[PDB]
């Protein structure tokens, strides 16, 4: 009866009966935000005044049999339920000591950071005009990369089972939590809040100076500054930087395998519906994991999920920055007496291309390349970037640089479209193009040095439109979620008929599994162990 009488005497006033009748439960969040909102009268000054005054604290009435009125020096700390501050410190010294010290199992999200700082070996501070990399990373470290809703449902189950949501489907985390803290409840609302802090992901956009994981971000204020930087290795690793890698490799190998299938789309679909990753189905991971990569984007597209409007090419993901596209089919002659019809994009465009190890900005008119600004790590990376750039230039200058017949097929011996053919021809050797491109004298301005065909930096001369950037070009992961139209051949055409994604830029160095993955749909076992094939 403790509670309901307030409801009854609340149902006494008709203007309250009406609101208690009409508004429904789905709307309670919309009504708790109806507050006067005036008691914001300088919390500093009100706090100071209330601290000067005795007894600002509200306790329960059960302090009588727990703490005394007179302290060990005869100090008054009660009223007639108000309590002064000294009672806290007295109880802070000598009271009911308790073995509830098992606390560091719900607050592990903090003591993980503590331990990371414990063995967190440091390094020297090499000051430098640090350049901001416009990257996007997570905020919570080691949270298994779980979305908010699928995590808060488990939360609601573990903390308030007597009012769980209607999701009853029949992950042992439920069992582990219900067992380790069954009768050792601490503070319900705070327990659930801190668990939501521990497990729920959230990833957004920040300028960083080399920090990859989340652990390199929670200590950003130590690392990053105006013109300084401090390398600090916490001595550890999390899931969010090495869980998605397993799905990446599994989808890359799945696409590598799907080409030989008659209808690669159907085999891929059965694979994705059957394949299990870390005990979790791959389909749900695709629906919930925001990782951007060709294989993952294509597998998501097969289930009709929006991705970024990218003109992915040369291993480099592209993004529309400005400019329009016009078809303008055209004839082309090779260096070995061969005719080729190709889709020369008409109109003006301006793009920013992001790569695995490099980035660049480009402006492009009708068969015109201008202002190519590149930044990479290795000589090989800037080499590949400049190569795919000159391929994309579509000038006749690169047209002249064709040597040998052009026969490059899929792993199923299938004729590839000409762009990828040129790319794969130049990737092994493309030194001949620079010597026949043209050189221009530069002025050594703004820390932008030139590059020569022999892969040598130079001061006062460079290629036409080329620029070597320092410590990274400004990335931008534009947010777009647009529908796509995949075909039966694992080709991607969103709305305009432009080839977006294709299984020609999918492979790199050997795949090394971290997460244990299992396929169950179709053959897809010629790679796994032979004993695995039998069993």
């Amino acid at each position: 009866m403790e509670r309901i009488k307030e409801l009854r005497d609340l149902m006494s006033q008709s203007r309250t009966r009406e609101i208690l009748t009409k508004t429904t439960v789905d709307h309670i969040a919309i009504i708790k935000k109806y507050t006067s909102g005036r008691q914001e009268k300088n919390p500093a000054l009100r706090m100071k005044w209330m601290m000067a005054m005795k007894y600002p604290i509200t306790a329960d009435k059960r302090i009588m049999e727990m703490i005394p009125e007179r302290n060990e020096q005869g100090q008054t700390l009660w009223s007639k339920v108000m309590v002064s501050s000294l009672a806290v410190t007295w109880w802070n010294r000598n009271g009911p000591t308790t073995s509830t010290v098992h606390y560091p199992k719900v607050y592990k999200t903090y003591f993980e950071k503590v331990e990371r700082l414990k063995h967190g070996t440091f390094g020297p501070v090499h000051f430098r005009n640090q350049v901001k990399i416009r990257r996007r990373v997570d905020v919570n470290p080691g949270h298994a990369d779980l979305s908010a809703k699928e995590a808060q449902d488990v939360i609601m189950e573990v903390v308030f089972p007597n009012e769980v949501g209607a999701r009853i489907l029949t992950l042992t985390i439920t069992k582990e939590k219900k067992e380790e803290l069954q009768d050792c409840k601490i503070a319900p609302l705070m327990v659930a809040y801190m668990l939501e802090r521990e497990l729920v992901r959230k990833t957004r956009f920040l300028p960083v100076a080399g920090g990859t994981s989340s652990v390199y971000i929670e200590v950003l204020h130590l690392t990053q500054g105006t013109c300084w930087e401090q390398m600090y290795t916490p001595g550890g690793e999390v899931r969010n930087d090495d869980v998605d890698q397993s799905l990446i490799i599994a989808a890359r190998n799945i696409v590598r395998r799907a080409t030989v299938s008659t209808d690669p789309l159907a085999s891929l679909l059965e694979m994705c519906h059957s394949t299990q990753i870390g005990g979790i189905r791959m389909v749900d991971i695709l629906r919930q994991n925001p990782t951007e990569e060709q294989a993952v984007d294509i597998c998501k597209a097969a289930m009709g999920l929006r991705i970024s409007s990218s003109f992915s090419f040369g291993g480099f993901t592209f993004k529309r920055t400005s400019g329009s596209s016009v078809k303008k089919e055209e004839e082309v002659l090779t260096g070995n007496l061969q005719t080729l019809k190709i889709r020369v994009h008409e109109g003006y465009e301006e793009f920013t291309m992001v790569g695995r190890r490099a980035t660049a900005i480009l402006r492009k008119a009708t068969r015109r390349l201008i202002q190519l600004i590149v930044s990479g790590r290795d000589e090989q990376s800037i080499a590949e970037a400049i190569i795919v750039a000159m391929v994309f230039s579509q000038e006749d200058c690169m047209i002249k640089a064709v040597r040998g017949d052009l026969n490059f097929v899929n792993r199923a011996n299938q004729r590839l479209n000409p762009m990828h053919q040129l790319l794969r021809h130049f990737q092994k050797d493309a030194k001949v193009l620079f010597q026949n491109w043209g050189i221009e004298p530069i002025d050594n301005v703004m820390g932008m040095i030139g590059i020569l065909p022999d892969m040598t930096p130079s001061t006062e001369m460079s290629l036409r439109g080329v620029r070597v950037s320092k410590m990274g070009v400004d990335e931008y992961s534009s947010t777009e979620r647009v529908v796509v139209s995949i075909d039966r051949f694992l080709r991607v055409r969103d709305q305009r008929g432009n080839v977006l994604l294709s299984p020609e830029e999918v492979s790199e160095t050997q795949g090394t599994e971290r997460l244990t993955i299992t396929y169950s749909s179709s053959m897809m076992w010629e790679i796994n162990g032979p004993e695995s094939v039998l069993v």
Partner: protein, 52 residues
């Protein structure tokens, strides 16, 4: 609604919604409530039909 609809349903009902909307050219981008209602009706009929 739209992205959730693509989350909680099969692509075959998606293609059926495509075909039924093309019957009158009903653009899904606007008739999102019609999108949900039609996918609902289809899956209702199906789970009424299974194992009978």
């Amino acid at each position: 609604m739209e992205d959730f609809v693509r989350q909680c349903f099969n692509p075959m009902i998606v293609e059926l919604a495509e075909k039924a909307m093309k019957e009158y050219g009903e653009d899904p981008k606007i008739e999102t409530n019609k999108f949900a209602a039609i996918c609902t009706h289809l899956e209702v009929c199906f789970m009424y039909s299974d194992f009978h």
